[PDB]
DNA sequence: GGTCAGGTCAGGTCA
């Protein structure tokens, strides 16, 4: 059946004027207060919990323990992440039914269900609605994190930039009631406004879009020869060049916006008809040449480049950019190294003047964002030996590369992991499936690759560092899952935890070992399987020590094989958790 | 049973 209740406000319901006859009269006073609360002054200092304790009479809850149990899930909603869920069970289970006065008159057998129902009501009709009334939730796009802005200042931000967009031709109204492709959302991006579109779901045309994008990636393969895998690029470049590596990374400003629809349409028509049929060709071009979008119940045309959020703008922008930089890429200096994922260029060469020339070559052809550009060039004001590109960190001097992590200060790492799956729901009495499914290798698979475990251009100690960081991530995921077990499963009778923990350390060590042996490097000495597993456990402890009273049984059990080969490993790094992970917030508390 | 090939689901990466 269904054992999950979703935390997102999306599923909320607009409160009725009166209680529905099914629910008890008590709720109405809450409802009344809610209306009063909505009418109440919209003071900018606002805490959802305080206002919420006023509108909801405590008498509904009866005892303070019952009330606190309910406001715990309210707090969870205030601190929610995308896709997060709780068990519906938690809304009735372990509630002191003797305290609830209105329930006391009713027969005990029906008390849970009724309670459940009523609790459900108050969340969908009051809690989620009032939160949505005072606050607006926007995805940070860093993990599953959700930032809560005051509704007023978000509407002012979105309308400010909406007028800043109507004034310029970027957004016009074509006003012929043409069907909206999707709804435009404006979601803050530091300085930039990052305007995107949530397309409306179309299942009938989705296979056609997939066919189209497949054909376009095939024209990118057949023509404009693939630039090559970044791993082998870096490998051959570091092996062939012995001198100091000078490199620059540049971020194209509004890569999708500044594409020219006329040029891209006439480029789409250029494709030979056997690789793309002319009827399909015409579809591609009139799709991208006519982009119609619904804003505040109004429809507008988008005439600035490729609309972001489309199901065919990515492959098209790649087609455009890759064709457009063919001249440089086709033949450069044999010494030189260049690579672009999408909108992000990375160029390294022994000769500094060449890197300088490349910066100015790209800067003239396109308009860049100058804060995002990173280089070790002496002429630049803040040269760095470590340059970040494609979710990795390349140190040009050391020639070492390490996984890049994006953890702002005060960031709560629990956001990074999706523990709840509404399509495949685990019952509350099956904690083992939840914890296991959380610890399946697929989530860290990206970091268990050649790039991070190769020793061809990576030092052995840097291989150790990458694996240690990956295991730290795994452990934070484990701890988050444990908290989820305690918050919603609430299964106190749990001893299966250690089996999953140990099995996962074993298996991840095996995977990293098998990928490390396959991509043996010249810098490779001897790499223990045993001390790799031991490093996994020390990485765990670095995280579990953050909640040592709650975990002390487990951590003391862990301490009782940690045997660490080669003198280059400092070994201080493995005992103390890295500085990046020390300040991430592992306790959730309502900040609104 | 042991491979494959297709398909599906899942969680992660990049921009
Ligand atoms: N549909 C989506 N497209 C995206 C997403 N992220 C990036 N992109 C596309 O990748 C391109 C690069 O995005 P970036 O985040 O690097 C910033 P953008 O290039 O839009 O401009 P600047 O902020 O001036 O750097 C962007 O133009 C678009 C996404 O989450 N969804
Ligand atoms: K960016
Ligand atoms: Mg970028
Ligand atoms: Mg960009
Ligand atoms: Mg991660
Ligand atoms: Mg997915």
XYZ file of C-alpha atoms (C1' of nucleotides) and ligand atoms in Angstrom:
643
model
C 0.000 0.000 0.000
C 1.099 3.591 0.683
C 3.114 4.190 3.857
C 4.694 7.518 2.862
C 3.549 11.079 3.443
C 5.371 13.693 1.386
C 6.848 16.723 3.119
C 6.689 19.107 0.148
C 4.122 21.889 0.213
C 3.057 20.987 -3.354
C 0.543 18.448 -2.034
C -1.088 21.035 0.257
C -4.783 21.878 0.034
C -6.591 25.204 0.190
C -8.422 25.376 3.502
C -12.231 25.181 3.312
C -14.412 27.816 4.936
C -15.841 25.175 7.276
C -14.712 21.821 8.560
C -15.860 19.050 6.312
C -18.602 17.083 8.043
C -16.286 14.069 8.300
C -13.837 15.936 10.534
C -14.592 17.116 14.058
C -15.853 20.607 14.877
C -12.686 21.406 16.890
C -10.693 21.991 13.697
C -12.858 24.994 12.785
C -11.450 27.164 15.561
C -7.981 26.431 14.194
C -9.324 27.264 10.732
C -10.847 30.466 12.119
C -7.551 31.382 13.772
C -5.780 30.560 10.493
C -7.932 33.129 8.717
C -7.220 35.602 11.515
C -3.549 34.618 11.246
C -3.617 35.254 7.497
C -5.312 38.593 8.206
C -2.880 39.282 11.087
C -0.103 41.784 10.358
C 2.523 40.411 7.965
C 5.417 41.332 10.230
C 8.775 40.563 8.627
C 10.095 38.838 11.827
C 8.094 35.608 11.722
C 8.529 32.092 13.121
C 6.128 29.496 11.723
C 6.198 27.601 15.029
C 5.183 30.565 17.198
C 2.318 31.723 14.969
C 1.368 28.054 14.564
C 1.042 27.451 18.310
C -1.492 30.290 18.440
C -3.822 29.193 15.644
C -3.905 25.548 16.759
C -5.390 25.147 20.257
C -3.234 22.961 22.466
C -6.457 21.272 23.632
C -6.555 19.323 20.360
C -3.335 17.704 21.562
C -4.317 17.423 25.228
C -0.925 16.657 26.756
C 2.313 18.486 26.016
C 3.995 15.242 24.955
C 1.353 14.605 22.267
C 1.635 18.212 21.020
C 5.426 18.042 20.894
C 5.240 14.833 18.872
C 3.056 16.583 16.302
C 5.220 19.689 16.130
C 8.228 17.431 15.502
C 6.844 16.563 12.057
C 5.976 20.223 11.551
C 9.635 21.019 12.250
C 10.670 18.280 9.802
C 8.568 20.022 7.134
C 10.214 23.366 7.897
C 13.615 21.665 7.541
C 12.639 19.512 4.574
C 14.712 18.539 1.559
C 13.473 17.667 -1.906
C 11.748 14.262 -2.210
C 11.824 13.818 1.584
C 9.076 11.730 3.180
C 7.929 10.429 6.546
C 5.856 7.395 7.389
C 2.135 8.097 7.552
C 2.335 5.748 10.554
C 4.138 8.399 12.640
C 1.018 10.580 12.604
C -0.935 8.249 14.927
C 1.494 5.738 16.424
C 2.637 6.152 20.040
C 0.289 9.088 20.726
C -1.153 9.232 24.244
C -4.792 8.603 23.327
C -5.880 8.952 26.960
C -4.957 12.651 26.811
C -7.033 13.567 23.726
C -10.378 14.700 25.215
C -12.589 14.541 22.133
C -11.190 11.097 21.305
C -11.830 9.869 24.864
C -15.601 9.830 24.273
C -15.144 7.712 21.105
C -14.444 3.981 21.157
C -10.696 3.254 21.490
C -10.429 0.951 18.449
C -11.144 3.807 16.028
C -8.968 6.375 17.826
C -5.764 5.935 15.711
C -7.453 6.205 12.301
C -9.557 9.216 13.319
C -6.486 10.800 14.921
C -4.480 9.993 11.791
C -7.148 11.543 9.575
C -7.391 14.696 11.674
C -3.621 15.057 11.933
C -3.422 14.649 8.161
C -6.040 17.379 7.770
C -4.221 19.905 9.945
C -1.031 19.419 7.949
C -2.530 19.675 4.465
C -5.013 22.472 5.230
C -3.151 24.589 7.807
C 0.568 23.874 8.268
C 1.656 23.536 4.649
C -0.725 26.352 3.543
C 0.499 28.824 6.188
C 4.136 28.013 5.386
C 3.395 28.624 1.707
C 1.573 31.845 2.613
C 4.457 33.437 4.498
C 7.382 31.663 2.792
C 8.217 30.506 -0.741
C 10.448 27.446 -1.214
C 13.139 27.524 -3.912
C 15.543 24.738 -4.804
C 19.158 25.761 -4.279
C 20.144 23.261 -7.035
C 23.005 22.223 -4.733
C 21.895 18.687 -3.981
C 18.310 18.320 -2.797
C 18.601 21.453 -0.654
C 15.632 23.816 -0.300
C 16.000 27.443 0.759
C 12.999 29.208 2.284
C 12.610 32.864 1.351
C 9.929 35.201 2.625
C 7.157 35.112 0.029
C 7.202 38.906 -0.217
C 10.870 39.375 -1.080
C 10.851 36.442 -3.511
C 7.879 37.864 -5.401
C 9.683 41.205 -5.467
C 12.847 39.531 -6.813
C 11.001 37.588 -9.515
C 8.950 40.633 -10.581
C 11.978 42.955 -10.534
C 13.817 40.660 -12.910
C 10.578 40.041 -14.846
C 10.386 43.751 -15.664
C 14.154 43.796 -16.279
C 13.336 41.098 -18.872
C 10.216 42.628 -20.455
C 12.065 45.907 -21.023
C 14.784 44.147 -22.987
C 13.590 42.141 -25.963
C 14.549 38.848 -24.203
C 10.908 38.394 -23.171
C 7.981 39.669 -25.224
C 4.257 38.922 -25.257
C 2.925 37.516 -28.545
C -0.617 37.477 -27.092
C -2.256 34.982 -29.501
C -3.128 32.386 -26.810
C -0.689 29.891 -28.333
C -0.408 26.807 -26.132
C 2.129 27.257 -23.296
C 5.119 24.947 -23.600
C 5.698 25.266 -19.852
C 5.711 27.696 -16.951
C 8.691 30.013 -16.500
C 10.260 30.082 -13.048
C 12.830 32.645 -11.933
C 15.098 31.094 -9.302
C 17.941 33.139 -7.747
C 21.520 32.430 -8.848
C 23.810 34.606 -6.709
C 23.952 37.771 -8.866
C 22.276 36.251 -11.919
C 18.559 35.478 -11.908
C 18.844 32.034 -13.641
C 15.492 32.025 -15.472
C 14.362 28.498 -16.335
C 11.177 26.831 -17.498
C 9.364 23.856 -15.972
C 7.908 22.189 -19.059
C 4.485 20.641 -18.794
C 4.631 16.825 -18.892
C 4.080 15.327 -22.347
C 4.274 11.540 -22.545
C 3.122 11.238 -26.165
C 5.907 13.423 -27.591
C 8.681 12.309 -25.209
C 9.841 9.317 -27.338
C 10.032 11.699 -30.298
C 12.220 14.124 -28.326
C 14.513 11.258 -27.354
C 14.798 10.168 -30.994
C 15.620 13.753 -31.990
C 18.314 14.296 -29.355
C 19.774 10.890 -30.245
C 20.108 11.946 -33.887
C 21.691 15.254 -32.864
C 24.290 13.557 -30.655
C 24.960 11.313 -33.646
C 25.616 14.319 -35.895
C 27.958 15.518 -33.135
C 29.725 12.143 -33.285
C 29.820 11.704 -37.074
C 30.813 15.339 -37.666
C 32.800 17.476 -35.234
C 34.887 14.538 -34.036
C 34.476 13.974 -30.307
C 37.017 15.988 -28.326
C 37.982 12.858 -26.403
C 37.552 11.564 -22.872
C 38.805 14.023 -20.252
C 40.634 11.246 -18.384
C 42.850 10.250 -21.318
C 43.247 13.911 -22.282
C 44.791 14.712 -18.891
C 46.737 11.427 -18.899
C 48.527 11.950 -22.218
C 49.045 15.666 -21.572
C 50.710 15.157 -18.180
C 52.858 12.301 -19.505
C 54.069 14.203 -22.584
C 54.747 17.538 -20.807
C 57.420 17.585 -18.092
C 57.542 21.330 -17.414
C 55.341 23.588 -15.334
C 51.731 23.503 -16.533
C 50.005 26.852 -17.052
C 46.244 26.559 -17.338
C 43.126 28.698 -17.418
C 39.484 27.776 -16.800
C 36.725 30.078 -18.147
C 32.918 30.113 -17.600
C 30.896 31.391 -20.620
C 28.351 33.981 -19.446
C 24.764 32.861 -20.251
C 25.921 30.128 -22.668
C 22.309 29.241 -23.585
C 21.057 32.821 -23.856
C 23.758 34.101 -26.181
C 23.241 31.403 -28.827
C 21.708 32.903 -31.972
C 18.481 31.164 -33.002
C 18.829 32.356 -36.645
C 22.301 30.822 -36.897
C 21.236 27.638 -35.091
C 18.156 27.159 -37.290
C 20.216 27.638 -40.447
C 22.752 25.203 -38.954
C 20.045 22.613 -38.251
C 18.900 22.907 -41.856
C 22.506 22.286 -42.954
C 22.535 18.706 -41.601
C 22.454 16.108 -44.413
C 18.976 14.730 -44.946
C 19.960 11.085 -44.322
C 21.229 11.863 -40.837
C 18.157 14.022 -40.124
C 15.018 14.033 -42.273
C 13.792 17.400 -43.526
C 10.393 17.035 -41.821
C 12.169 16.313 -38.525
C 14.618 19.105 -39.408
C 11.760 21.580 -39.825
C 10.303 20.417 -36.512
C 13.604 21.076 -34.738
C 13.920 24.552 -36.235
C 10.340 25.736 -35.666
C 10.429 24.317 -32.132
C 13.496 26.400 -31.300
C 12.331 29.403 -33.370
C 8.940 29.557 -31.606
C 9.235 29.169 -27.818
C 6.057 30.120 -25.949
C 5.978 30.220 -22.158
C 3.337 30.861 -19.492
C 4.186 33.257 -16.668
C 1.572 34.755 -14.304
C -1.361 33.306 -16.266
C 0.044 35.031 -19.364
C 1.872 33.711 -22.428
C 5.092 35.227 -23.778
C 7.633 34.472 -26.505
C 11.310 33.833 -25.675
C 13.645 35.330 -28.290
C 16.969 35.177 -26.409
C 18.866 32.053 -27.428
C 17.849 28.588 -26.304
C 15.234 28.410 -23.570
C 16.752 26.818 -20.431
C 14.677 23.867 -19.155
C 13.715 22.624 -22.641
C 13.950 18.888 -23.573
C 16.110 19.589 -26.677
C 18.121 22.739 -25.849
C 21.089 20.890 -24.324
C 22.032 18.744 -27.307
C 21.390 21.748 -29.561
C 23.597 24.144 -27.601
C 26.288 21.460 -27.565
C 25.895 21.049 -31.335
C 26.228 24.813 -31.820
C 29.221 25.333 -29.501
C 31.058 22.213 -30.708
C 30.633 23.210 -34.345
C 31.609 26.797 -33.516
C 34.912 25.922 -31.811
C 35.853 23.322 -34.447
C 38.438 25.638 -36.020
C 40.556 25.914 -32.857
C 39.996 22.315 -31.721
C 40.611 20.717 -35.139
C 44.343 21.401 -34.943
C 46.013 23.183 -32.041
C 49.584 22.921 -30.839
C 50.469 19.298 -30.150
C 51.805 20.458 -26.777
C 48.503 22.049 -25.823
C 45.543 20.593 -23.930
C 41.968 21.860 -24.214
C 38.588 20.507 -23.103
C 35.025 21.824 -22.751
C 32.269 19.875 -21.083
C 29.472 22.364 -21.850
C 29.896 26.168 -21.558
C 33.071 25.509 -19.471
C 36.488 25.714 -21.205
C 39.775 24.428 -19.739
C 43.083 25.053 -21.531
C 46.558 24.051 -20.332
C 49.974 24.433 -21.960
C 53.614 24.570 -20.867
C 53.991 27.962 -22.572
C 52.338 30.752 -20.516
C 51.840 33.095 -23.481
C 49.630 30.463 -25.128
C 47.340 30.249 -22.077
C 47.195 34.055 -21.933
C 46.375 34.182 -25.655
C 43.636 31.595 -25.155
C 42.049 33.620 -22.364
C 41.911 36.664 -24.622
C 40.784 34.590 -27.632
C 37.756 33.273 -25.748
C 37.171 36.656 -24.088
C 36.918 38.348 -27.480
C 34.698 35.760 -29.146
C 32.299 35.346 -26.205
C 31.395 37.436 -23.177
C 32.604 35.718 -20.010
C 31.954 35.913 -16.248
C 35.258 37.182 -14.812
C 34.818 36.063 -11.204
C 34.482 32.424 -12.271
C 37.676 32.335 -14.361
C 40.587 30.638 -12.596
C 44.212 30.403 -13.716
C 47.769 30.140 -12.422
C 48.882 32.782 -14.927
C 51.189 35.279 -13.163
C 49.586 38.232 -14.966
C 46.227 37.494 -13.349
C 45.708 39.063 -9.941
C 44.900 35.937 -7.874
C 46.716 33.026 -9.548
C 45.952 29.561 -8.183
C 47.781 26.281 -8.644
C 44.511 24.400 -8.014
C 41.908 24.995 -10.737
C 38.359 23.579 -10.492
C 36.808 21.993 -13.580
C 34.089 19.409 -14.213
C 33.495 18.571 -10.570
C 37.216 17.940 -10.045
C 40.222 19.933 -8.828
C 43.310 19.890 -11.072
C 46.495 21.177 -9.464
C 48.675 22.239 -12.394
C 51.946 22.248 -10.445
C 51.402 18.984 -8.563
C 49.499 17.451 -11.544
C 47.103 15.920 -8.985
C 43.307 15.861 -9.282
C 40.809 15.422 -6.444
C 37.018 15.272 -6.292
C 35.328 18.663 -5.930
C 32.677 19.088 -3.231
C 30.242 22.009 -2.887
C 29.467 22.516 0.818
C 28.840 26.172 1.740
C 29.257 27.156 5.395
C 26.343 26.141 7.647
C 25.164 23.730 4.925
C 23.229 20.678 6.148
C 24.668 17.619 4.418
C 21.509 15.543 4.920
C 20.163 17.445 1.900
C 22.675 15.732 -0.409
C 20.953 12.329 -0.143
C 17.487 11.215 -1.270
C 16.462 8.552 1.245
C 12.746 8.446 0.414
C 11.253 7.006 -2.779
C 7.525 7.527 -3.304
C 7.458 5.087 -6.241
C 8.991 2.258 -4.165
C 7.967 2.665 -0.526
C 9.342 0.665 2.402
C 7.005 -0.061 5.298
C 7.855 1.338 8.721
C 8.567 -2.137 10.145
C 11.277 -2.855 7.520
C 14.238 -0.655 8.549
C 16.753 -3.024 6.950
C 15.471 -2.395 3.418
C 15.567 1.375 3.996
C 19.138 1.425 5.311
C 20.369 -1.015 2.660
C 18.699 0.803 -0.253
C 20.315 3.949 1.130
C 23.756 2.292 1.115
C 23.718 0.821 -2.404
C 26.921 1.644 -4.286
C 25.131 3.481 -7.211
C 25.050 6.776 -5.284
C 28.851 7.019 -4.953
C 29.549 5.249 -8.264
C 30.658 8.534 -9.853
C 33.603 8.825 -7.465
C 34.761 5.205 -7.871
C 36.307 5.682 -11.301
C 39.688 5.560 -12.996
C 40.141 9.337 -12.683
C 40.160 9.280 -8.885
C 41.829 5.897 -8.309
C 44.294 6.001 -11.205
C 47.921 6.389 -10.164
C 49.261 7.221 -13.643
C 49.269 10.967 -12.941
C 47.901 10.822 -9.378
C 50.087 10.198 -6.354
C 49.339 7.205 -4.161
C 48.550 9.536 -1.255
C 46.155 11.493 -3.478
C 44.441 8.215 -4.397
C 44.123 7.599 -0.658
C 42.726 11.116 -0.204
C 40.071 10.669 -2.903
C 38.955 7.312 -1.504
C 38.882 8.723 2.042
C 36.719 11.665 0.956
C 34.346 9.303 -0.868
C 34.004 7.153 2.254
C 33.360 10.285 4.334
C 30.463 11.041 1.985
C 29.183 7.475 2.378
C 29.327 7.825 6.169
C 27.397 11.097 6.207
C 24.756 9.321 4.113
C 24.723 6.461 6.659
C 24.234 8.824 9.620
C 21.480 10.732 7.809
C 19.730 7.406 7.146
C 20.082 6.509 10.839
C 18.375 9.745 11.845
C 15.639 8.935 9.324
C 15.228 5.531 10.971
C 14.848 7.216 14.359
C 12.510 9.963 13.152
C 9.958 7.918 11.208
C 10.661 4.188 11.449
C 11.096 4.728 15.223
C 11.999 1.034 15.480
C 13.918 0.886 18.758
C 14.466 -2.883 18.417
C 17.348 -2.654 15.947
C 20.536 -4.723 15.895
C 20.751 -5.384 12.148
C 22.611 -2.075 11.679
C 26.127 -3.470 12.103
C 25.719 -6.106 9.377
C 24.791 -3.482 6.761
C 27.584 -1.183 7.955
C 30.338 -3.816 7.776
C 29.097 -5.339 4.512
C 29.129 -1.900 2.892
C 32.661 -1.064 4.044
C 33.819 -4.431 2.679
C 32.077 -3.997 -0.680
C 33.127 -0.386 -1.299
C 36.724 -1.302 -0.467
C 36.458 -4.151 -2.979
C 35.122 -1.839 -5.696
C 37.751 0.854 -5.130
C 40.465 -1.815 -4.999
C 39.344 -3.438 -8.259
C 39.176 -0.069 -10.018
C 42.557 0.933 -8.564
C 44.334 -2.252 -9.664
C 42.901 -1.982 -13.186
C 44.207 1.575 -13.579
C 47.637 0.962 -12.122
C 49.988 3.920 -12.455
C 53.702 4.511 -12.674
C 53.545 6.154 -9.245
C 51.926 3.010 -7.799
C 53.844 1.159 -5.080
C 51.880 -1.465 -3.085
C 48.259 -0.786 -2.099
C 46.734 -2.849 0.693
C 43.213 -4.159 0.494
C 43.293 -4.331 4.302
C 44.376 -0.765 4.989
C 41.911 0.425 2.328
C 39.054 -1.103 4.331
C 40.661 0.310 7.485
C 40.751 3.769 5.887
C 37.049 3.340 5.158
C 36.450 2.653 8.854
C 38.556 5.598 10.052
C 36.656 7.793 7.582
C 33.449 6.497 9.149
C 34.660 7.242 12.682
C 35.598 10.780 11.625
C 31.863 11.277 10.990
C 30.376 9.126 13.762
C 32.419 11.005 16.384
C 30.287 14.055 15.512
C 27.415 12.416 17.486
C 29.387 10.303 19.934
C 26.759 10.010 22.688
C 24.163 8.666 20.241
C 26.742 6.491 18.465
C 29.094 5.518 21.307
C 28.071 1.866 21.383
C 28.709 1.663 17.648
C 31.955 3.658 17.641
C 33.446 1.657 20.524
C 32.425 -1.469 18.614
C 34.263 -0.085 15.574
C 37.504 0.578 17.458
C 37.945 -3.099 18.370
C 41.640 -3.474 12.285
C 43.293 -0.147 11.417
C 46.815 -0.971 10.163
C 48.332 1.670 7.878
C 53.450 0.900 3.208
C 54.927 4.042 1.636
C 56.276 7.052 3.500
C 54.587 9.583 1.214
C 51.247 9.096 2.980
C 51.305 11.693 5.751
C 48.635 9.603 7.580
C 47.520 12.594 9.686
C 44.767 13.236 7.124
C 43.001 9.924 7.809
C 42.681 10.274 11.581
C 41.008 13.713 11.649
C 38.045 14.438 9.383
C 38.974 16.896 6.589
C 38.233 20.569 7.183
C 35.615 20.591 4.411
C 33.362 18.191 6.336
C 33.911 19.622 9.836
C 31.464 22.533 9.535
C 28.539 20.843 7.764
C 25.418 20.973 9.933
C 24.300 17.506 11.108
C 21.508 18.661 13.429
C 18.263 19.936 11.915
C 16.434 22.786 13.645
C 13.729 25.084 12.291
C 15.396 28.347 11.215
C 12.055 29.983 10.333
C 23.268 -22.646 -14.655
C 26.513 -18.967 -17.384
C 26.729 -15.638 -20.551
C 24.979 -11.969 -23.652
C 21.500 -8.628 -25.404
C 17.276 -5.711 -24.753
C 14.188 -3.315 -21.151
C 13.245 -1.379 -16.632
C 14.150 0.733 -12.083
C 17.469 3.215 -8.659
C 20.870 6.807 -7.021
C 24.713 9.779 -8.239
C 28.061 13.344 -11.815
C 28.344 17.538 -15.288
C 26.569 22.194 -17.377
N 17.660 22.539 -17.941
C 18.805 22.855 -17.279
N 19.855 23.474 -17.903
C 20.983 23.775 -17.206
C 21.052 23.411 -15.740
N 22.307 23.854 -15.374
C 23.089 24.449 -16.334
N 22.277 24.407 -17.508
C 22.776 24.931 -18.625
O 24.200 24.979 -18.552
C 24.644 26.298 -18.962
C 25.672 26.715 -17.987
O 25.021 26.995 -16.740
P 25.797 27.658 -15.560
O 25.229 27.145 -14.238
O 27.299 27.356 -15.632
C 25.504 29.545 -15.655
P 24.990 30.238 -17.283
O 25.897 29.583 -18.369
O 23.515 30.062 -17.550
O 25.426 31.741 -17.116
P 26.373 32.474 -16.050
O 25.663 32.495 -14.720
O 26.641 33.890 -16.497
O 27.672 31.734 -15.916
C 23.453 27.231 -18.748
O 23.446 28.300 -19.700
C 22.272 26.317 -18.985
C 19.846 22.731 -15.137
O 19.842 22.411 -13.950
N 18.815 22.503 -15.945
K 27.794 29.087 -13.569
Mg 29.535 26.851 -15.530
Mg 28.002 29.639 -17.531
Mg 27.724 13.030 -3.081
Mg 17.430 10.206 -11.990
